[PDB]
Subunit: 232 residues, 6 copies
């Protein structure tokens, strides 16, 4: 089977959607849409009755809710329903309001994984987003490989299908070799104008579009154009 991202054009680009248990790496530079994209993935997940967990390391949950809320995505209700979770692995990297979930020390991936399996259990999560995974090893690159594979085993085991968001200043040291899929979002200046484009570089378990497709970010999120191709 597959997992329908719900993101206009994407499921057609993946020929049906993301294969189950697959951990997809969404990489790209700043402002390419990785945040809106992965949030949309989870949001659409909810509308289809699929449990979702957002592991934030870049922003605090109260902030994430506000960002999504501005696109017309109110997770608060589902949060009360027990169909959506927000894991705070953010306040730990900046200092010290509680939450159902929180990682106090990311020195090790141990507590990180402990708290993760909890949120998955409580809502029987199906969809998961780690934004971002880069923060777990940016200053400890040799440990990236083990970290990516370990989180992978855990998620796939619980039947979850994942987007790891990778921040790029390549796709990210075994990281791009460890994941099942790779979707790169690009923002390129062409003839004096910035053009957004998406391309599925890798996707274990399926055939997929081999073309670079433009896309726009709108008030209601991302919209990819499967019938169009952008030439850089």
């Amino acid at each position: 089977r597959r997992v329908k991202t719900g993101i206009p054009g994407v499921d057609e680009i993946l020929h049906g959607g993301i294969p189950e248990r697959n951990v997809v790496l969404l990489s790209g530079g700043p402002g390419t849409g990785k945040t809106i994209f992965s949030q949309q993935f989870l949001w659409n997940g909810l509308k289809m009755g699929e449990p979702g967990i957002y592991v934030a390391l870049e922003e605090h949950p109260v902030q994430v809710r506000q960002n999504m809320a501005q696109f017309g995505w109110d997770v608060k209700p589902y949060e009360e329903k027990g169909m959506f979770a927000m894991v705070d692995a953010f306040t730990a990297g900046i200092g010290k309001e509680y939450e159902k979930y929180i990682v106090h020390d990311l020195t090790d991936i141990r507590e990180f994984i402990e708290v993760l399996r909890q949120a998955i259990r409580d809502i029987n999560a199906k969809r998961v987003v780690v934004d971002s995974v880069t923060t777990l090893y940016i200053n400890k690159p040799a440990m990236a490989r083990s970290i990516i594979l370990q989180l992978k085993r855990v998620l796939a085991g619980t039947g979850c299908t994942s987007i790891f968001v990778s921040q790029v200043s390549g796709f990210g040291p075994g990281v791009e070799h460890g994941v099942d899929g790779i979707i790169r979002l690009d923002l390129d200046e062409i003839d004096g104008e910035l053009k957004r484009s998406l391309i599925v570089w890798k996707m274990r378990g399926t055939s997929h579009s081999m073309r670079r497709h433009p896309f726009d970010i709108t008030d209601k999120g991302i919209i990819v154009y499967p019938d169009k191709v952008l030439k850089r």
Copy 2:
């Protein structure tokens, strides 16, 4: 979302209304691209609108900053006496004033002092010139430094600009995590095209709003910066 008007000709148009309230905007660019003049113009316009502002100086002493702003027609003195503007001296300490940061070993005193200045004048706009100096010899501390300041500023209702210094040639914005941690990124460029340096601005990122995706030329004048939303740079200036 509510917008903060920069007042800089062309910029609020380019931002489809202005900077979304509480956004931290990274103003990135090489030397002599107009980043300092731009950030000060942003603060001055705020004052004219009744929005108290703070300029955290890490590149020059506040005394010189006041002098330089005055030459553009921006005398902050009348405002400092009204408790509507403030200069934080985070410069002196770098090379051995109501607001002073004595030690930049840790970001702790920097924050305490910034918080002090914020409540003192009911600040709405803040400028840090420049953020790079806070970790340029501490690259690994950049991420947490940017994320901690951002939290303090948005948490106190401020809308800010973080000036980011990049060395000429590099199209970077500031490095790992920093360009990822800010809410917006406005790049000011100075490119040599056919034996001529041309200035241009481009909004690479701005959370909470759509914005022009084109590279617009601009000039630095006696009255500050002026961006031209109706012109684009495609290896040469052209209308629309």
Copy 3:
């Protein structure tokens, strides 16, 4: 003698196939089809009476079996008849040890045990074909050791009459590794005019002449298909 990969087009491109006992480095970036190519190589071998061994360092043998099954390649039958074997050199890398697997390398910090289990596996099934996916994981965090490791494994495998494929992960071909192996086959995925095109090229192959051209190929439901009579210069 030639070891036939059985992968459509490959053997013609190798003018017969891989010279026996050769260690071939299969290099490429992520998603270029290296795992599938090497597994297809083992599969075809089983189909022609040649025992094979897949040494996993990137995935657990269980998932590998699954993955190969989706392509129509069920090894389970051969595994019980002593014709195929998976070597778990993965778990040690993550941490878990909560399962039973015949061949398993507990510690990857030394190539000593790795070679022990490999020798035992080759002994047990009389291995003729061996795949290591990926050798890169064995020295990524020890590049100065890569040279010895490649030549060491090279001596073992070749000594036991095995012909092997070492999968190399590229983010060149890998310092001194590209020199240690007998052959080099590069799998590429390049964006040309807004579209990703898959291609293969034989850079090196001690023991034989071979196509000096870049050939397009496709990954399908039944695996890889390479086109010997087609060439991808650049664009078409």
Copy 4:
């Protein structure tokens, strides 16, 4: 805002009047781009204008510097004995007779600064050259920023306008101005060009202008531009 005339042919026009008083200007370029001749002509024209100048030597011994200048027709001797010109020796302490101003330890700029303050005070200097400031931190780049900022404050606070020579093979953000001298090979020929990247306090030509080094120093052509690899206009 007052202007300091470099007196170098074409340069003041390009700077739209001259260097804004008290500005520290970084003169950056690779070897043999003309940075030393330029900075020395700057001081010379200054002297021949009643403006006392100091040349801080970190690359050659003052004795040799005096020799290089005289060869172009700039004899500082008369001006030096008259207390209108001064040479600072911060060269010897870097590798191994008599010189009025000498910096014994370059470990850190404190002594460097003191000797510099003395020379300025002593001749009431108006122009100062540091050839080259790169040498003060070539092995300690993390110190470059503070050093540049410290010297800038000392010089500006004393009313001097300076040129820091930067040898290329937060510094550029710290100085007030930046003039790049280039030497590029185009069609089998080496062409010299100058370009003002930045100059706080004023507007200036935004073009790359060609120049020649002659027996009498540098001549820049403000009415010419170097575009592809050709001199146009």
Copy 5:
């Protein structure tokens, strides 16, 4: 000046007679560019001309080198038994841990390496020597490359030998300056096609072709074409 004929078709002509005797020639190139074959051809042809030769192996065990040379019709067995050819084993020591007349037990430094080499040159009155590859002697200690190349050079030239130092380059200090000559072998992809070329970058003691010449590797070794040149494709 006295010349040493390589015997490789086209080479001696490109060298205007051949290698100036007593010269050390660095044969540099990436993987699969034909450096081993070229070097071995040089020695084989040397034997056929009554010029004893030595091959210092650091990449493969002398056993395998013998069998690979035979693969091209170069059976050194007849000459060795007659004290005309020698195989130095400076390989096994490289991967830790068989009798070989000439073996180097410690590569930690090159004193022993020089001893063994000195012994072999004397025993056979060697006139041609090949070291494959000299890169392995300092790959992990770049700073020592210069002195090692200069030391080996003084010893070889001191014994009247003419040599070829094979240098392994991946993809792209003292070394190239320390040798007498430099012959680069390349393998480049142009328009979906891999093309082999040789160019004499330096050869002390003589003039030589200043052009890049294409060449082929066959079942009988290398063949260089002095009448062809690579502007970018093969032209006249």
Copy 6:
């Protein structure tokens, strides 16, 4: 300023008279570009104009070096005897502590102190007016931070004794620059010897990037290496495409 004539065909013209006295000229380029040959032709011509030269050898033994210059029709034997020419052995110490015969020998290259000691002594016994250090790169290649002081220290020495010199600088093939931060700003002159593949052919060319004290050709001139030495063509220009 009196010019030291190189004698090398076409060079003194390109330099508009020759090399300004006391100038330390860095001659750099990749392997096989003709730097050693160029430096020797310089000392040789220095002899014929009745000018005493020294050749500091760090890449070859003085015996081999002599055996190399002779191969070009340059026999310095008669001059070493009249004391009009000297050769320094700074090669052996680089690859061992072995003994041998040579009037001038530098035993330790850890520091440049002895080097100068021996050099000043060598300049004295004869009438050292021309000097060649080949290659200066060897002095600091493993300790790049020392390059600057080493270069300037040797400069002062030679200039202080009225010597005009060439420092041979070895750069790797493909490397653009001349020896890095230190070397290139500290020398008075820089002459680049290039060997570039243009249209399937290697072409030799020279270009003067810097020469304090004089004007000079600003163009790239082709040249040939012959059995008699180097021949640079001042009236020809090579166009590399860069």
